[PDB]
Write a protein that binds this ligand. Structure first.
Ligand SMILES: O=C(c1ccccn1)c1ccc2ccccc2n1
Ligand SMILES: [Cl-]
Ligand code: NA
Ligand code: NA
Lengths: 305, 303
């Protein structure tokens, strides 16, 4: 029993984190095969960052301007190039700890584990959802850039996130490992803001199913609803639309618990309109939306890596 | 900035997790140097659930009755002994991935990471706290016994928990790595129940300090309190007593934020009286008690 916000075991990724220094800036890099990946803004001074011309900044750099340390072992950089907002440093040694991995780009509402790193050293791991406004509600201090986000699927690590910056509201923004930002952001010191966020409806439903599996069922009711009726309510409450594919994805949990998605949607409708009335669900007084349906199945089944 | 329940990176512990089989029972072991540690109840049969005589059950076992598998490799068990409620299987290979480590017994309120494991392989990592009633609120399925809890400090893993059992309320009970249970529990299936659980007050206070550090001040007030008046009120909400040791521990965060410890105590008293009135603190609509003072300073300031 029990239900916790749970990250993937991070060992396969820890073996890949290195320290990258350029000039006065030190941040983290991801060492896979013979390439170290990191944010291209590593090459900027603070005044460069105001309006950077990255290709121009980069051509002046020599390989020896990139100091890469793996543990207390220096790595020799033998080439450098940029892909979108990610710098690729070719090194002379393949990482012997390179795991089976892919680069994947995730969709808003999907979750992943963040391995928060400083000076190349893994320091903490936690689970994040990609918000509908393409930010993540992370915990990152100065020096955390280049920390990465990932899932594990069988024995394959899927890297989906690299950390780049903090927005003025304290939420976080970055790229996939191919250097494409999640969200309408740019790697520049300039006024940027997250759009108004919304709640991940399919994830809330998944978490209600988690609650039921764990014995927490006071919110269940006799009613059901329609997708159209439910989505009208969800729109009212800044909840993402529930689509037919979401319903299909929850199918397993609907068959396992006896509560159909639209049956549970009627529970969620009533929670939105009437609140929780002093009660909690899995120890929370808020509706939790950072567990996907797969997260709930995986945790309530004990899948391993 | 930001504030999240964060776990230690699990790799140093993943490299120590093995599978231990005795008879039809399989659970997890911790392999450090040439010893595998696991719950002694791995030797129980279905007849031995209520009143096992572990000394009598163990003397009947041979080394080859213990099957220990590290990844794809079988380890040879060359000796075995019992320490309190933990079994120590000597093996013929030192684990080449053994980290710098120590065994530490923790006090209630302390936090640690759990690497939930099944069949010797890691499933996930999460953060939790030793409750005042010496249980933990874990996430554990059948087969998770022998999963461990730990902190990491620089490069050194401090093992503080190993999982033995789930109580009827769905909370979890276990031992330190010397095999001594946390709390009044025993590794028997006889009726056992945790004491009533209370909120870890010093940790709530630390978390309020974390909220101020991250820029939230809405819950502060102009009042202070004596320590005794604070405890008299807080106990009525099933909060643990706040001791002078706790006030001292909160000294650093008090200085950092400029809010005296008993001033923050008065803010907490008002929150208990008022609720949140639809607001949140660091993303929660409830007061959070599974961040220690040490945790808050680490998460907000780093090393
Ligand atoms: O919050 C932290 C944490 C991590 C694991 C378990 C509990 N808490 C944290 C945050 C930033 C850090 C930076 C450098 C070193 C350690 C750090 N730890
Ligand atoms: Cl302690
Ligand atoms: Na219903
Ligand atoms: Na293993």
């Amino acid at each position: 029993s029990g239900f916790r916000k749970m990250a993937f075991p991070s060992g396969k990724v820890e073996g890949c984190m290195v320290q990258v220094t350029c000039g006065t800036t030190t941040l983290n890099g991801l060492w896979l095969d013979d390439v170290v990946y990191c944010p291209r803004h590593v090459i900027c001074t603070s005044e460069d960052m105001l309006n950077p011309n990255y290709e121009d900044l980069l051509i002046r750099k020599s390989n020896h301007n990139f100091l890469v340390q793996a543990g207390n072992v220096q790595l020799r950089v033998i080439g450098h190039s940029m892909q979108n907002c990610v710098l690729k440093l070719k090194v002379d040694t393949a990482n012997p700890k390179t795991p089976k991995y892919k680069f994947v780009r995730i969709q808003p509402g999907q979750t992943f584990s963040v391995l928060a790193c400083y000076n190349g050293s893994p320091s903490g791991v936690y689970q994040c959802a990609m918000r509908p406004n393409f930010t993540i509600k992370g915990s990152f201090l100065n020096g955390s850039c280049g920390s990465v986000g990932f899932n594990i699927d069988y024995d394959c690590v899927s890297f989906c996130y690299m950390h780049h910056m903090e927005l003025p509201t304290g939420v976080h923004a970055g790229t996939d490992l191919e250097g494409n930002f999640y969200g309408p952001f740019v790697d520049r010191q300039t006024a940027q803001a997250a759009g108004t966020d919304t709640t991940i409806t399919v994830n809330v439903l998944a978490w209600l199913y988690a609650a039921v599996i764990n014995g927490d069922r006071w919110f269940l009711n006799r009613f059901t609803t329609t997708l159209n009726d439910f989505n009208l309510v969800a729109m009212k409450y800044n909840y993402e639309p529930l689509t037919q594919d979401h319903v299909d994805i929850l199918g397993p949990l609907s068959a396992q618990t006896g509560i159909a998605v639209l049956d549970m949607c009627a529970s969620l409708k009533e929670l939105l309109q009437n609140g929780m009335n002093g009660r909690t669900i899995l120890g929370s007084a808020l509706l939790e939306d950072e567990f996907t349906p797969f997260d709930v199945v995986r945790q309530c089944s004990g899948v391993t890596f």
